[PDB]
Design a protein around this ligand. Structure first.
Ligand SMILES: Nc1nc2c(ncn2[C@@H]2O[C@H](COP(=O)(O)OP(=O)(O)OP(=O)(O)O)[C@@H](O)[C@H]2O)c(=O)[nH]1
Ligand SMILES: Nc1nc2c(ncn2[C@@H]2O[C@H](COP(=O)(O)OP(=O)(O)OP(=O)(O)O)[C@@H](O)[C@H]2O)c(=O)[nH]1
Ligand SMILES: Nc1nc2c(ncn2[C@@H]2O[C@H](COP(=O)(O)OP(=O)(O)OP(=O)(O)O)[C@@H](O)[C@H]2O)c(=O)[nH]1
Ligand SMILES: Nc1nc2c(ncn2[C@@H]2O[C@H](COP(=O)(O)OP(=O)(O)OP(=O)(O)O)[C@@H](O)[C@H]2O)c(=O)[nH]1
Ligand SMILES: Nc1nc2c(ncn2[C@@H]2O[C@H](COP(=O)(O)OP(=O)(O)OP(=O)(O)O)[C@@H](O)[C@H]2O)c(=O)[nH]1
Ligand SMILES: Nc1nc2c(ncn2[C@@H]2O[C@H](COP(=O)(O)OP(=O)(O)OP(=O)(O)O)[C@@H](O)[C@H]2O)c(=O)[nH]1
Ligand SMILES: Nc1nc2c(ncn2[C@@H]2O[C@H](COP(=O)(O)OP(=O)(O)OP(=O)(O)O)[C@@H](O)[C@H]2O)c(=O)[nH]1
Ligand SMILES: Nc1nc2c(ncn2[C@@H]2O[C@H](COP(=O)(O)OP(=O)(O)OP(=O)(O)O)[C@@H](O)[C@H]2O)c(=O)[nH]1
Lengths: 221, 221, 221, 221, 221, 221, 221, 221
């Protein structure tokens, strides 16, 4: 058991363009449980360098929690052994109109601070030879989001990965989000938010198809 | 008594486009009541296979309910013996402008999980030689909605049917919906929603007409 | 005392187009208070057929009311003797831009079921040599509304009516409305609504004008 | 086949208090199809009395429609032969706290003008020995709603009927609604709305229980 | 490995009150993959019994999907092997005031129809010796929500379980939920929603405390 | 320069009640700029255990930002050298009613995951001999907000701090917050929120006062 | 002391286009206080003509009140001695983009019934050689508002005045408003409203500029 | 230590277009503390001119406060010493689509009265060779804002300054603000607001890009 056929295509396709998350070759496959006990230590250290009484029955566990949260959760998207199982059906209905999925839950982390990123993504595409199972578009967004990110790049990734799996370039990804490393820290701006978009295929070349999308983006409930 | 003049025209027209819902020739007409007893038999088993104390007064009747639900309710739209009665009125006012019926209630089920689909549909058209009774639009939407469905197809069928019955191509359908097989299970995205559309006639070729429609789409109360 | 100049013009213009509500020549003018008596009698017969105890002090006067409501109220628009008193004012300010009246209260009845029609209307036009008194637009919408109606036609009449009076073809009418014979009966669609429009003059030929209008249409408070 | 056991109890329990809708002993059972043909003739008359060219392909069917709508739909609750099938389950959970079913859809007709009544009902009860199937409180409300009504009484019947089937006085009912006979005609008050309630059992004696309810009433979405 | 300490206590606590979901002694431990393949079989039947072309590449998988869904998902709460890991921390701050967790996401299924139940819960308690890790309340709620349910009971269990684990009877649970077997099928009430509550400890005996709770329940965003 | 008079009292006050955040005797005052460098290197380690390319001109600096954040930012509230400069003004207007500050911006971190906490807090007190300057309330909240926290404890600290500085027991603190370690990870509850309250003096003893406060709590814009 | 340079130009500019409010040459300068005493008299008369007990301590002063209101208040824009002191600043910043002041409070009187007109005005212009003080657009609007008006015209005067004072024609003005002599009297239309617009310069010739404006017109809060 | 490279480029770039705030050569660098004592002196003087009892322990400090505020806060943007530390990253992801930062908290003061200005700014740019870190756009906006301003100029400075640091003319800036010197003083308009914008690069020449921006402007929550 290695990877998946789609995960390969997708990963490679992102490296070609250099839109892959800056990683170093894994080299040797250091036990996964081993990386948690190690990471925990470094935390068990940072907490002491801050004078946090690790004798406390609550703070005590913290280090193992943060470790687990890193290896197994908020960053699981860095291992392609986690790429969502993609499923498509043949386009017999012949849908030549865009299918949209709006207000997709996106939970991420800026790579600059390792601080929360709360945002919504709106994906859209024009089926060609096949139609993707709706939920997939969800799982894919969340996949790339579970990584130390940069908004402008996270968007590009979602765009390319979908084109790849879809077999078209007629895909559009738009992400609207808030950076707590901007809201609860430093400039502490309570009301701003950043919106990034990546247009492919007709979405970028056709003035008409372009705006037909942008207009239907950014909705509440 | 066999069927109706509209039900056939619409049905045959949909098979021509291979847009009908994947069915097998009925073959013989086994007693409608007989099916509910059989389908009832199986579920009785599945519930046993789940360790569900079928002695209990409440669960006891469940099997019969599901069967009834499948045969006589949520899938009723599979039998054109239930196609809504269509009634038209000559277009003497010569209405050359599009009529729009928005926020139409649409209840359905995904054929992949046999799970609830909740959304609203929007239909518009341009009367040619006849205007359809407003409640017919509603009724046709709810007819095809009452089947094991796929949102991309469901939108297509409604289009074609109304085109057939109305005798024009100038018809536009636009469904918005939430798949619980995508919200309460699996990826569990609690905020996402899928928007599909089917544009015909001028609603597809006329840049102007097209947008006029789309712009008036997606409304709350 | 016959009718009114405008009334006549408007009436004839609508008969010219055949956009008059389907009526039969009055013939003789059978006492108005005499029809109320015959109609009240028929309602009495119907109520009895419904096993309603007409002996009851409350149900007792229902017939008289329903008869009254029919002849002297909800259908009062069927007699041009009720046409609003129009009044204009020379266009000395030289208004060459459209004037708009949005969210006009429109009460009407569906001629198919004699049930309530609840909707709002938006009227706009471009002054030529005269400017109508604002409340006039209102009175006229409610005049035509007070008849057994068909939305598509109710809209055509108002358009033409104002065209006649204003003396321009630059008038647009749009009606958003809810049909209770849809909502509370039959399909019972609690959320749906129908929007029908009628564009004239520049509003129909000028893409620019046409959209400037439609955009300002459909508002709340 | 006569009626149902519960349909009886309720009817009886309703006549006892004199809260039944003013009805006359049916006498002979006049064929149902016979009434609709007799009532239709009556509308055919009233329409000719309004100078409605019944020759028109549209206005032509109106009579049979109204007739069918009277006998088969909007008043079908005047026949206990339509009473919903009540079903209950043993209160093994011993739920000694109230169960509320809010914003229940209620469609009705005022007996004074045979005009539309648009409202929402909120029902609550404290289970005693049995817990009613949720969709039953909905069915009973709509049952009595489908009759020529007076809001004040409409509330009363629901309350009683429920108390009866439940075997408890602990039931509270409250309806919130708009009479179009007051909004689209006559005083034409577009904003008013009427609220009427009927507190039973502890909902009327317990100062605490009472308010707990009232406060939990009148909600939007 | 059998179960967990807490899992047993809560399970017994419920059976002792007769609040455990009506089940049957599992008997033998038949292979888990074995049930899906069986369940999958029957479903394959029912689908055939409905004339659904199992030949189609999409519906082809459905039987295996529903099987998976039943055993491995939506009903996953029936196997106490999945009870969330509970973790508390000595009440050293002596929090003598109630802690409230609102708008908790709740997904369930009605044992009566095996249909979706969309709802939100509001849990609150008053710390005695221990404070529960916030997310545990959320976990316990979705734990019992993943079973063939009945709102009135679901609310009960959640209370009892919490009381058990927390070591106090001062715990209130309130669920507001929409049953789709009542909104997209049957009476089809597009707006009603049921609200059930279960008060314990002071939340039931103390008038003040009881109301402090109920007043802050039912919130949007 | 050691500290401030206020800072001491408050700190002593909290220690006395055991409501101080779990810490360890500082011992020696190792260079603040030396701790940053060690913490930074430890992050450098974790990032290399995740397979991140620290070579990237962007990820390159993260280790320093985080080190800066943890020492000179998100936890600054651990050092009372940073305690806000409180300033009072004799109560000559004899204000004997409560002063309430609502929707105070509160930015915090959970000591269980070292993750974001987004919330607002409302604080009210009854001026005795002095009236605190409105912004100090804000400052004081944020002071205790910047620390590895537990909401329950965060609430108490703020309360006692204020009591102490105000020379009264009549203050009330309420924090309504959202934990991302609950929203964007784990159970992932997109909608839940936690409300905690701390009542002192009258706000706890007088049912009259108590509710006056609680009701005026939880506001939007 | 006679008038003001600007006031003069603006006045003449308006007289030139014939957009001045229908007035008569003052002739002689009758004392201002003298007019109040005369007007008051007439009101005293009319009120007696309404059988109002002018003996009552309250109704007694109404006469002097209406007079004072007519002379020194609601119609004060009828005297250019009140025109606002305009003030401009050289456009060194070279702003070649439009400046928009939206939602400006506009209070006027319909000359037809001497009844309240409630609305909001939106003004936009493209700076040429000078930039007007913001507050001025406000003042100027209110200046022409305090007069017996006609919406279509009150809009014209604003445009022209503004163009004149600004030394440009790139000016746009839009007023959205309610006329109580239409809401609470006559047709009594509780929900309708009027919108009037006057486009100048590029706002009238440039398709682009036009829409950019219209689109940012009509906002709430 | 003098200033910063960027601070320089920007400052000059502005001096070239004359968009710098009207300032006089510093000449000498009088001690900063020295200024606060003199400025405080004048205020101590002005308050005595207004018969304000400076004896009062509260009004006492005020002079120093207003001194401090002028020199160290609301005007700190007048000394490039406070210019934010910009930090970019190479555009390897080649983002050829605009990046939008909406609803930036902007706090300023009109130079005409030295009174509050509360608003929000929206910025967009198309990455050329570099990508600005997000929080930067925020601090740049807040830099220039902290000055005796003029909304039409404040906008320009933000445009120019950004362009210069970005290396592109493809930078757009909008400022929706409320001038209190207009709301709570003079004309006192409690509802109006001013909107200004500055378009550069494609945002100005390309009709497409231009609207794509404008449309996405003016948002709430
Ligand atoms: N395009 C489309 N996809 C649908 C529709 N209904 C369900 N689906 C998709 O069908 C897929 C189910 O694919 P499977 O391969 O069986 O996997 P699964 O275990 O059901 O996967 P998840 O549902 O994502 O947990 C998903 O992608 C659903 O989102 C529908 O109307 N249209
Ligand atoms: N373009 C972009 N910038 C991001 C993203 N996430 C964090 N940033 C920005 O990266 C920058 C961090 O820059 P640094 O120079 O290390 O400075 P800092 O001390 O973190 O600065 P502040 O965040 O303003 O306090 C800031 O501009 C963050 O807001 C992201 O997804 N995209
Ligand atoms: N085009 C149009 N149709 C209308 C209007 N008002 C009511 N109708 C439709 O006219 C039809 C009545 O057709 P019938 O054939 O008598 O059938 P019915 O039993 O009355 O129809 P249902 O309402 O579906 O029960 C329905 O489709 C109504 O919804 C209206 O203003 N315009
Ligand atoms: N209490 C009550 N009154 C109702 C109800 N429905 C209609 N009504 C009232 O019954 C009255 C009809 O009384 P009538 O004496 O016939 O007078 P009318 O000309 O029909 O009355 P207006 O509606 O004022 O035009 C009105 O006051 C209606 O508003 C209802 O459910 N409850
Ligand atoms: N009472 C309280 N609990 C908190 C607070 N912040 C985090 N927690 C809870 O502390 C717990 C962490 O307990 P652990 O046993 O380490 O479990 P975990 O895997 O980290 O927790 P989850 O995965 O989130 O269920 C969870 O219940 C968190 O949600 C807080 O302010 N107050
Ligand atoms: N009290 C309660 N009733 C429920 C719940 N879920 C489903 N039900 C009700 O159980 C009943 C099903 O009763 P049956 O006698 O089988 O009738 P049915 O044809 O399924 O009923 P209808 O739903 O009215 O069509 C209905 O009242 C459902 O709405 C639940 O959580 N609580
Ligand atoms: N265009 C612009 N005008 C501003 C700005 N700030 C204040 N103003 C306007 O500048 C003007 C001050 O003009 P002055 O002639 O001194 O008169 P004033 O007594 O201050 O004016 P009023 O505010 O009408 O009382 C007013 O129109 C203010 O509203 C700003 O940023 N831009
Ligand atoms: N176009 C315009 N009409 C206005 C304006 N103000 C009042 N009016 C209209 O001027 C008319 C007065 O005309 P009249 O012939 O005296 O009739 P009336 O009895 O006052 O009119 P009703 O209000 O319909 O009763 C009405 O149509 C008012 O609504 C205004 O600013 N613009």
């Amino acid at each position: 058991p290695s990877l998946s056929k789609e995960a390969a295509l997708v990963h490679e396709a992102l490296v070609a363009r250099g839109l892959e998350t800056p990683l170093r070759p894994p080299v040797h496959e250091m036990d996964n449980e081993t990386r948690k006990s190690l990471i925990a230590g470094h935390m068990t250290e940072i907490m002491q360098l801050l004078n946090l009484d690790l004798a406390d029955d609550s703070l005590m566990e913290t280090p193992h929690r943060i470790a687990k949260m890193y290896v197994d959760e908020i960053f699981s998207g860095l291992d392609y052994a986690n790429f969502p199982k993609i499923t498509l059906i043949e386009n017999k209905m012949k849908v030549d109109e865009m299918v949209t999925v709006r207000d997709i839950t996106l939970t991420s982390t800026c790579e600059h601070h390792f601080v929360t990123i709360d945002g919504k993504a709106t994906v859209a595409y024009i089926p060609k030879d096949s139609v993707i199972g709706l939920s997939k578009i969800n799982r894919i967004v969340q996949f790339f989001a579970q990584r130390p990110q940069v908004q402008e790049r996270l968007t590009q990734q979602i765009l390319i990965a979908l084109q790849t799996l879809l077999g078209t370039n007629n895909v559009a990804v738009s992400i609207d989000a808030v950076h707590y490393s901007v809201k609860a820290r430093g400039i502490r701006d309570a009301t701003s938010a950043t919106t990034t978009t990546s247009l492919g295929g007709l979405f970028k070349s056709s003035q008409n198809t372009r705006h037909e999308f942008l207009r239907a983006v950014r909705h509440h409930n």
